[PDB]
Structures are given as structure tokens and as C-alpha cells.
């Protein structure tokens, strides 16, 4: 009955929001990531890092507001408040992009804390820890996109900025510069998210439409009891239905719910890997066989070549404003453009 | 015992390994026609003048494509929304050059897929089920109607319907962004929420049920052998899953009613995908995403760029490059 | 010396074979274009 | 098309090695019961 045990008692008390040992890492960091983002998007600019306005205070709305990345000139500086860049000046720190690193790092330690919380609560309750395991997928995406990707590049400047439209810009960047849609690891992520969404919908609809009549009312929700032993819907009728409609069906409720875990988690893990490649500009940009044929044969055209013209447009037209530190000056006559437009 | 009544009995029999039904009677021929034409066209169709400018795009494997770049190419802009069945072409060679096969495939598919949805109702009725699984499939079906039919109708050409291929798909979604700013459209944002949320709740539900399987097996066997098809007892402890998830957040953000939970699983991705299909369907009439270009200016009137202006620079580069030979006048009005 | 007591039989049911082959075939279908490049 | 010659062997093995693995384990599963 030493003090470490006393605190364990207190941390692990059953209350409206459980605390746990994980709460010590989780709650400060989650609140600070979240607070930084609300603070920067309400009040803080991107003029000196980006040449952009980015707060409600400046007249931006909820779609265009962002906590923007630091200037390219900061390299991969941690940009600590007390560091040699801001030298402890809160105001300068905000103007140099310090809230980006603040949010990204406290966010990363919150994610850890949250996953430790899934572990801690699962151990105290006596269930298996598959929800923590599944959460490895969001972590993989966050680290690879916000941390690994820009660490392979010239600076944090090229990571995603924390904002709706800044993220949209990030999507478009990856198309023009990385041809990211062509990447098989992205494609597996797409199948994992879309197949996840399908599984979610088809499983929900099936349960709701093979229900047993366990009550007299037209609202079928009332006739479930969380402690009944009985399945509330017919796996048997569900299985005949889908066998006859689609050819195959699930027959095993355990496999089904594991597959529901498996599909979106794996898909996210695959996309993470592809973004690791793009950290190094190791893209699936091209098909060599296509380019050789098209260079030699001006009548050969595919959707692959059509899409690279668009990437080429994107790069030349967005680069000067999107990378102001490069001082790109593209006179009119060098911009690629089709006829008339 | 009569002939027609015995036929009707077989059409609607719950004993066929695959249910036919009256919707099946239209579905099966039309999906066979669309499938067979698709497979042949994907492998061996010659190039198609999608944009009506006598510039044919090679879509098939034997004309130098791989699985990633190949497509059935949309029919010619010169045709627009005119119906172009085989028997309206002087010859198959013409029908091929102008992109006939796309029309054949999408009309047969959209028919057969509409009957697919109806077949889902039907068998639900023959088996004594509740009937609305088909309502969930209407979300994907509405999405396919939007990109193959609605968007062409509004823009006036099947040449602007989505190509039947992997890179053709990407081409469609890049051009859409330049012409409609779909990223900045709230209905697409609800699609993303419906689809991200769908994959999230998929993982959640699967991990929660899986976390609360009741020990029925040993460490040397798959846990899945703890459930026997058709057993009456539920195979996981829902109170344990509620007890974990409500403590992971707080009690009242967690479902103890499996019916509400599974109905939630159904409605979130379905409604999100309805909206995103509605997005494509209304951008088909050029009610485009929010435009905040130059919306912030300073006291003198200098434009102060935001992230929306950066998006615009990228959309501009898409705009000016796409269909680089097809525009003779300064505005791309469809 | 006794024969080893930790030996265990291995199983792959028919459904797992179908799922496994689909996975490999579809994986091959996806990456083959990149292998030929 | 001027395509990576080894793509073929790579694809065949990519398919063949994992598939044969699965078949081996399935067939010896059926010989048990």
C-alpha cells in the first residue's frame, strides 16, 4: 500500500471519463494539439511562411483557415519555443510556423496515449485488445504523412498543413508532382477504405433486414436486450439470401467481424507504405514502355499520357505561388497550355 | 401443372442455387451483354475518337495498353447524346472508331444493375425478410448513374462520362476538379465523411466484436471455430464490448443496443454516398464548389491569397491542359 | 530419446484456399503492369 | 512494347509460389478427415 499503488487506485477509478496511467500522456497532448489548431485557425497567419492568410481574424472561413507549415528555410527544425529560431518570443514563434510543429508533435504523443488507453482499458475490463491493434492503422497514416514524408523532403514546409483547403491542396500536389493515383499502394488503400465502407453498410443493412420478430411494435429497436443470449438476427436467412443473390456469403460470424477489422486496417497500412516511398520521390510516375512508344509514335495516346499533360499543367501553374521560396518566375510564353484556354 | 405457371414457379423458386426472379429475367441478359462486350473491347478494341476531333485514344491491351492504362473509351463528342446502336453505323469499323461499345456497355450495365437492386427486394420477399437491403445498394447504384448517365446528360455528351478503365477514371476525376472544384463542394465532403467514417466504423465494429469473443477454443485453433453456423446463442459478449468502448470515450457515446448499432452502421455510409452521388448529379448542371478566389483583399485592395487561391492555381493547370486540341474559343462552357 | 511432443497438424480449409488464391491472383493482376513497366 | 523482360518470370513466380503453398496445405487437410 505504497504511494505508487495509491495513485494507480486513483487513476483507475470508474468515473464519467476514465483517466488511467495513459491519461497522463493522452489528455495534455490531445488538448494541446486541439487547442493549437483552434488557436492558429482563429488568430494566426501564414503570411511570413507562405504568403497566405489563414485565420478567421484575417477573413478566412472554415474551409480556408489552416495552421500552415513553417517556411521552407526552417528545414526540419523542431521549432521549439525556446529554440534558436524563435528564441522564446511567442509572437515570432507563431509567425515562423511554430504551431505546426507544436500540433504535429503533441498530436503524435496524443495518438500514442490514446492507443495506450485502448490497451489499458482493455486489460482492466478483460477483453482482447483488437481495438488498439486496429488503431495502429490511423497511427501509421499520421506518422507517414505528417512526419516521415516531409522528413524525406527538404523541410516541413511540404507536409500537409492543418486545414480543409490546405489538405485539398496537398491532394492536388500529390497528383501533379507524384502522380499518386498511379501508385499501387494508394490503390490498395482505396480498396481498403471503399471496401471498408461497403462492408460497414452491407453488414448493417443485413442485420436490420434479417431481424427476428422479438417484439410487437413497428419500431424494431425496442425488442433487443443487451443481455439476451440469443442472436437478434438470423445468420441462416442472411446466408441463404446472400448465397442466392451474390453466389457466396459469410457463414461464420467471427470471421465476418474479423474481416471487417482486417479490410480497412490493411488498406490504410498499404497507403502508409506508398507515402513512405514518396518521402524519397520514389514514385510510380511512369510506365517506361508507354513513354518509349509515345516518344517515337506521335499517334499513340492513352489515358496514361493524357493524365501526365494534366500533371504538367498543375506543376507549372501552381509552383510559383505554392513554393514562394523558390522565386519561380515563369513568363507567360513558357506556361504549358492547350489551344484557346 | 400448366406450362406458364410452372415457368413462373421456376423463375421465382427459392430453390435455385442462384435466384432468378422477374428482375433476374432482365438482369441476366443485359449483364451478359455488357460483360461480354466489355471483356472483348478491353482486350482488342481499336482506338476511339473520344473527343470528336479525329484524335483517337488507344484503350485496349492489344493496342499497347496494360491493365492500369487500358479502358473502354467513351463515345465521340461528335455523337453527343445521340443514341448510337450498332445498326446505326455504316459498319462495325465505324461503330468502333466512334466509340459504340461504351454506349452498349453502360446502357446494358445500368439496366442490369437496376434490376440487380430490384432482385434484392424480390428475394427478400420470397424469403420472408425485411426489404430494405436494396435501399442500401441504391447508394452505389446512384453513384454509377451519376458518372455514366447524369453527368453526360447535363454536359451534353457521353464523351464526358467516366471511362471504363483505371487511368480513365483518374482522368475523369482530375478534369472534374478543374471544371467543378469538386473538392470544395459540400456534397463531396459528405461523401468523404461517409466513406472515411464507413471504413472507421467497419474497423471499430469488427475490432469490438472480435475483442469480446467468448472463449470457445484453445490457443492452437482459430477462434472462428468457436462459432457454428446457425447456433442460437450469440458468440460475443456485447455488455463487455459496451463496457470497454464506453470507458474508452464515455458511457453515453456507446451503443448497448445491437439494433441501433447495426442500423447506424448502415445509414452512415449510405447517406454519405447518396450525397456524393448527388454531388456529381448536380455539378452535372454546373452548380459547382464554393469559389473563394480573391475573396480576401487588404486595405488597399491587393489580393491576399489563401489556400483556396492555391487550389485555383492547380485547377487552372488542369483546365488549360486537358483536351489540349479541342477548344477553339476562350471559355470551356461544357 | 522420445519423439518430439510439440508437433502439431496444420490446416487450411477450402474457403481459406479460395480467399488465398483470390488474393494472390488479384495481387498479381495489380502489380503485373508495374513489373512489365 | 519495349517492356521489362523479367516482368514475365516475376509475375509467373509471384503467382505460382504462393498458390502452390496454399494448395499443398489444403490437399493435406482433406486427406486427414
Amino acid at each position: 500500500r505504497g504511494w505508487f499503488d495509491i495513485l494507480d487506485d486513483w487513476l483507475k477509478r470508474d468515473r464519467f471519463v476514465f483517466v488511467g496511467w495513459s491519461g497522463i500522456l493522452l489528455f495534455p497532448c490531445a488538448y494541446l494539439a486541439l487547442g493549437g489548431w483552434l488557436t492558429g485557425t482563429t488568430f494566426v497567419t501564414s503570411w511570413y511562411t507562405h504568403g497566405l492568410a489563414s485565420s478567421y481574424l484575417e477573413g478566412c472561413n472554415f474551409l480556408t483557415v489552416a495552421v500552415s507549415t513553417p517556411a521552407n528555410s526552417m528545414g526540419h527544425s523542431l521549432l521549439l519555443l525556446w529554440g534558436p529560431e524563435a528564441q522564446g518570443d511567442f509572437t515570432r514563434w507563431c509567425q515562423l510556423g511554430g504551431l505546426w510543429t507544436f500540433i504535429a508533435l503533441h498530436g503524435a504523443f496524443g495518438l500514442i496515449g490514446f492507443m495506450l488507453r485502448q490497451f489499458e482499458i482493455a486489460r482492466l475490463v478483460g477483453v482482447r485488445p483488437y481495438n488498439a491493434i486496429a488503431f495502429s492503422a490511423p497511427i501509421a497514416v499520421f506518422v507517414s504523412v505528417f512526419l516521415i514524408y516531409p522528413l524525406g523532403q527538404s523541410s516541413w514546409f511540404f507536409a500537409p498543413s492543418f486545414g480543409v483547403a490546405a489538405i485539398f491542396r496537398f491532394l492536388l500536389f500529390f497528383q501533379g508532382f507524384h502522380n499518386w493515383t498511379l501508385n499501387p499502394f494508394h490503390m490498395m488503400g482505396v480498396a481498403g477504405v471503399l471496401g471498408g465502407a461497403l462492408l460497414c453498410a452491407i453488414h448493417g443493412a443485413t442485420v436490420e433486414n434479417t431481424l427476428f420478430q422479438d417484439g410487437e411494435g413497428a419500431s424494431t429497436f425496442r425488442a433487443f436486450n443487451p443481455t439476451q443470449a440469443e442472436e437478434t438476427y438470423s445468420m441462416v436467412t442472411a446466408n441463404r439470401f446472400w448465397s442466392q443473390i451474390f453466389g457466396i456469403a459469410f457463414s461464420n460470424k467471427r470471421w465476418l467481424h474479423f474481416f471487417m477489422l482486417f479490410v480497412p486496417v490493411t488498406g490504410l497500412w498499404m497507403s502508409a507504405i506508398g507515402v513512405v516511398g514518396l518521402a524519397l520521390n520514389l514514385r510510380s510516375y511512369d510506365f517506361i514502355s508507354q513513354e518509349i512508344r509515345a516518344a517515337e509514335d506521335p499517334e499513340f495516346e492513352t489515358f496514361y499520357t493524357k493524365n501526365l499533360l494534366l500533371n504538367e499543367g498543375i506543376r507549372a501553374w501552381m509552383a510559383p505561388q505554392d513554393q514562394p521560396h523558390e522565386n519561380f518566375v515563369f513568363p507567360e510564353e513558357v506556361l504549358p497550355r492547350g489551344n484557346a484556354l | 401443372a400448366n406450362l406458364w405457371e410452372r415457368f413462373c414457379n421456376w423463375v421465382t423458386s427459392t430453390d435455385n442455387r442462384l435466384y432468378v426472379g422477374w428482375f433476374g429475367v432482365i438482369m441476366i441478359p443485359t449483364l451478359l451483354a455488357a460483360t461480354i462486350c466489355f471483356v472483348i473491347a478491353f482486350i482488342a478494341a481499336p482506338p476511339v475518337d473520344i473527343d470528336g476531333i479525329r484524335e483517337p485514344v488507344s484503350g485496349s491491351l492489344l493496342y499497347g495498353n496494360n491493365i492500369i492504362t487500358g479502358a473502354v473509351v467513351p463515345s465521340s463528342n461528335a455523337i453527343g447524346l445521340h443514341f448510337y446502336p450498332i445498326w446505326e453505323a455504316a459498319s462495325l469499323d465505324e461503330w468502333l472508331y466512334n466509340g459504340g461499345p461504351y454506349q452498349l456497355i453502360i446502357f446494358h450495365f445500368l439496366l442490369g444493375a437496376s434490376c440487380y437492386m430490384g432482385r434484392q427486394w424480390e428475394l427478400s420477399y420470397r424469403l420472408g425478410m425485411r426489404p430494405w437491403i436494396c435501399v442500401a445498394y441504391s447508394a452505389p447504384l446512384a453513384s454509377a448513374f451519376a458518372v455514366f448517365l447524369i453527368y453526360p446528360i447535363g454536359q451534353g455528351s457521353f464523351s464526358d462520362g467516366m471511362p471504363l478503365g483505371i487511368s480513365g477514371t483518374f482522368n475523369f476525376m482530375i478534369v472534374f476538379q478543374a471544371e467543378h472544384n469538386i473538392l470544395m463542394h459540400p456534397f463531396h465532403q459528405l461523401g468523404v465523411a461517409g466513406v472515411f467514417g464507413g471504413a472507421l466504423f467497419c474497423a471499430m465494429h469488427g475490432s469490438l466484436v472480435t475483442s469480446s469473443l467468448i472463449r470457445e477454443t484453445t490457443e492452437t485453433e482459430s477462434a472462428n471455430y468457436g462459432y457454428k453456423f446457425g447456433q442460437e446463442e450469440e458468440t460475443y459478449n456485447i455488455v463487455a464490448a459496451h463496457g470497454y468502448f464506453g470507458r474508452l470515450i464515455f458511457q453515453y457515446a456507446s451503443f448497448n443496443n445491437s439494433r441501433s448499432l447495426h442500423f447506424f452502421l448502415a445509414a452512415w455510409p449510405v447517406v454519405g454516398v447518396w450525397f456524393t452521388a448527388l454531388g456529381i448529379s448536380t455539378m452535372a448542371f454546373n452548380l459547382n464548389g464554393f469559389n473563394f478566389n480573391h475573396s480576401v483583399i487588404d486595405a488597399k485592395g491587393n489580393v491576399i491569397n489563401t489556400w483556396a487561391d492555391i487550389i485555383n492555381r492547380a485547377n487552372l493547370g488542369m483546365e488549360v491542359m486537358h483536351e489540349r486540341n479541342a477548344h477553339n474559343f476562350p471559355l470551356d462552357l461544357a | 530419446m522420445e519423439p518430439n511432443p510439440n508437433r502439431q497438424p496444420v490446416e487450411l480449409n477450402r474457403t481459406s484456399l479460395y480467399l488465398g488464391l483470390l488474393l494472390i491472383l488479384v495481387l498479381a493482376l495489380l502489380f503485373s503492369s508495374y513489373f512489365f513497366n | 512494347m519495349e517492356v521489362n523482360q523479367l516482368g514475365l518470370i516475376a509475375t509467373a513466380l509471384f503467382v505460382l509460389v504462393p498458390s502452390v503453398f496454399l494448395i499443398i496445405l489444403y490437399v493435406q487437410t482433406e486427406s486427414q478427415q
Binding site: - | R17, G230 | Y18 | -
Partner: peptide, 30 residues
């Protein structure tokens, strides 16, 4: 050769479909 490879794999998947549907493990109750 790449054309043959692509169609071959696709053909295998269609065949697999056939066996997965008509030669499945038949689900048996309890």
C-alpha cells in the same frame, strides 16, 4: 507476352469464381 499474361490471370480469377460458388464448402447448421 504481356497481353497473354494479363488475360491469363483474369481468366484464372473467373475460373476461381466458378469453383468458389458451385464447389464451396456447403454451410451446415449447428
Amino acid at each position: 507476352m504481356e497481353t497473354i499474361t494479363y488475360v491469363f490471370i483474369f481468366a484464372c480469377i473467373i475460373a476461381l469464381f466458378f469453383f468458389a460458388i458451385f464447389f464451396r464448402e456447403p454451410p451446415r447448421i449447428t
